[PDB]
Symmetry: D2
Amino acid sequence: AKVLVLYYSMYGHIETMARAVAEGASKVDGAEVVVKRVPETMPPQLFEKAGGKTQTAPVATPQELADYDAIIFGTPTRFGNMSGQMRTFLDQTGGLWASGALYGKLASVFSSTGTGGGQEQTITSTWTTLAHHGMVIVPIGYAAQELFDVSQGTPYGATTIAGGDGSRQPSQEELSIARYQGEYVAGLAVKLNG
Amino acid sequence: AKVLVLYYSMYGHIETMARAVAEGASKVDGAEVVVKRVPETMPPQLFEKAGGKTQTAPVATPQELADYDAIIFGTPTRFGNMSGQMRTFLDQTGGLWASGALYGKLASVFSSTGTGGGQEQTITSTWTTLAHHGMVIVPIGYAAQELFDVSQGTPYGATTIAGGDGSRQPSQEELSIARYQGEYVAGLAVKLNG
Amino acid sequence: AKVLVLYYSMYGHIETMARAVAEGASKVDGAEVVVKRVPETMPPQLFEKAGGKTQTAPVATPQELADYDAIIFGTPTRFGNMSGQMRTFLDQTGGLWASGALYGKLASVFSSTGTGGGQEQTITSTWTTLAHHGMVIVPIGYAGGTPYGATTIAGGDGSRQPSQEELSIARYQGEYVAGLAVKLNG
Amino acid sequence: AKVLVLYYSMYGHIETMARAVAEGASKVDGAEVVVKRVPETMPPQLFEKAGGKTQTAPVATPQELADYDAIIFGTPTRFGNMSGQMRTFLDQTGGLWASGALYGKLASVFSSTGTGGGQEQTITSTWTTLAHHGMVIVPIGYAGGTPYGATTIAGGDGSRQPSQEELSIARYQGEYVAGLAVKLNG
Ligand SMILES: Cc1cc2nc3c(=O)[nH]c(=O)nc-3n(C[C@H](O)[C@H](O)[C@H](O)COP(=O)(O)O)c2cc1C
Ligand SMILES: Cc1cc2nc3c(=O)[nH]c(=O)nc-3n(C[C@H](O)[C@H](O)[C@H](O)COP(=O)(O)O)c2cc1C
Ligand SMILES: Cc1cc2nc3c(=O)[nH]c(=O)nc-3n(C[C@H](O)[C@H](O)[C@H](O)COP(=O)(O)O)c2cc1C
Ligand SMILES: Cc1cc2nc3c(=O)[nH]c(=O)nc-3n(C[C@H](O)[C@H](O)[C@H](O)COP(=O)(O)O)c2cc1C
Ligand SMILES: O=C1C=CC(=O)C=C1
Ligand SMILES: O=C1C=CC(=O)C=C1
Ligand SMILES: O=C1C=CC(=O)C=C1
Ligand SMILES: O=C1C=CC(=O)C=C1
């Protein structure tokens, strides 16, 4: 089964989370995992002025989403919605919609916030779009503690706190939940698709 | 795989929908389908005064939800939320929550409204609760037309219009979508659980 | 202007928050504030088995909601929705709905939760209902903190009591809503 | 009171609705109404390839939103969210957010959709953002019809134009919001 971790990050928090999701997914024998980012929509001059972080991941096209059995979407919280960059990218999936290209495929979502507020709304409003595509939506609930690789309130998807100033980095507790999410979704993908 | 169609109905619209969901689910070889209702919370005197409809389905207990591989929830729209009866029943699932009893099981939702407004919100706010339980959420999207048994804008779950006066009954077009939802969810249940 | 603080509480957390909301609203000249609860739907036997804290505020009827200029609704988070008790109560407001009785009145929401998340969804899914009644919805913005409404964290075991800061935010919500009610209604 | 009707439209449906909203708002004595659009983010080449209807209303800056007493936001339904263009625009209001510039101002939302559903989710997920800014949210209630805000059905092929009834509801939304803006701000 093929698993895509598709993300947008301005300052690297979601990028670090994406790498954790991919790490967990890679634990599943038979899962082929790929990490890509959506295009930055800001001119590079403005992105650099704003202290945006450069990233090694390849840029996804909308059309290539059709190639995967599961897609795990990562976005920062922007006033309780997904980012404009992710929204703009998803608005380019009308062709896939019309052909049924994503119907029945697995989808799951992770996020990041400065100070917590809005994270739930970001995830559930992303689910809405995934449902228009007919995707099967995978929340994380509160999984059995022994399934997390770090011993230790986010049932919709993994999250991390960036701090009011953006300077906080994901903790190992937060990354462990992201790794669980990837492993769990990839396992489902293999169970459904081989 | 065992599939529960669990519903609340005051005037029979959701009951008719539930029967359609169950009919579709029953098409799947290997799916064992059962239909139950949540308890009425109104005293019978008031229910009868209000013109409520008597129903043959057995009354579910909260604990028995643990016995199923998939649960398809039906509720009328009450100001854009599930009914009080369904909410009250789900509030009795704390024990299941604590034990992980519903984690990873399939869930899907159908509804009914008088005049359309609120149906989307009813379904997505029901999804929230299912996600706290760790259930895998199955929207219906816009499925391939040849999969509906009646040739013919509801991607979250099947719906029906009861009319402002409650006198409209589900059309065959609406029931066909409910039947598709049951068949689709039961197929997934068998693919995951045998 | 008349302000109703209308709440459901099983273990007392929302009850404590409701008192704070009312205190804040009472700081506003011209605001007449009343605190009521929705009925418990559980038989007392089952409420007591569950370790409930018996509520003694006056019980509101669904119909009296029409008498207020602003209503501030309190509910615990129950798997990211309002409680069944609050939902059952609101399901009895169909008569008001039909008559337009709450149309244009102010509404605002506060909640309580354990440490599991869901509070944001509880508040926003409560807003949906208020909108069907045509109520004007008042979030708190950036005045487990959300801009949607005041919250308190009760702890996984329910033993935490609202913090000083959480009660201050609840007081602010009452004061702010009551002020808007007076600006609109005198 | 100053009322901004701020919209995004690709094929003209929200543009037509915005004109109606503005007409309604303009019926209110003391309301000063302005209609602006958010920038198109697509290069014109791609907008034209997609059959877009070139928009000519003045383009709003994110910062000028602070100048209004009420803002009525229009966006097409894009898989149950606002459009990427409206989202990109709102993502540029962080400077206002930090300064509290929109706090307490009135907000209301209208939308357009094909026949697929999602309009309710578009409106309510737009409300979330408005709440982060501390805006007071105005649904229309029972004054593809929703109590959340005016809508129009564009058809599966986009060829339907707003109906007379849909434009009447849009006018009502503008009139109602503008009236509340004048009651609050003169
Ligand atoms: C326009 C804008 C809106 C924001 N809205 C929120 C918010 O609603 N809640 C929050 O806690 N943080 C908010 N933030 C902080 C971002 O979520 C934070 O920068 C992001 O999670 C960092 O992830 P990244 O490094 O992957 O870009 C916002 C930031 C911006 C620029
Ligand atoms: C308290 C209450 C609230 C309602 N809210 C809505 C609503 O938000 N939207 C709507 O279109 N119909 C609404 N209705 C109509 C119900 O959805 C309708 O009675 C129901 O779908 C019938 O299903 P049933 O026969 O299975 O009970 C409401 C009815 C009641 C009693
Ligand atoms: C049925 C049920 C569901 C609950 N769901 C959640 C939840 O989704 N998230 C959460 O953090 N706490 C949850 N809780 C814990 C309650 O929110 C907490 O006990 C409640 O806020 C107490 O408020 P009260 O003392 O006013 O009743 C739940 C509790 C019950 C009984
Ligand atoms: C990316 C995209 C997603 C869409 N999603 C939906 C949808 O979820 N439901 C719907 O009924 N129509 C949907 N539509 C159709 C639009 O809502 C319709 O073309 C739009 O309302 C037109 O408004 P405008 O003319 O102002 O651009 C979508 C269109 C596009 C381009
Ligand atoms: O979903 C939840 C249920 C109960 C609780 O305490 C926390 C979260
Ligand atoms: O919001 C609504 C309430 C009741 C009804 O019948 C239709 C809509
Ligand atoms: O989800 C949808 C996408 C496009 C459209 O036209 C209708 C619905
Ligand atoms: O709503 C919010 C916006 C920005 C931020 O940094 C934190 C919260």
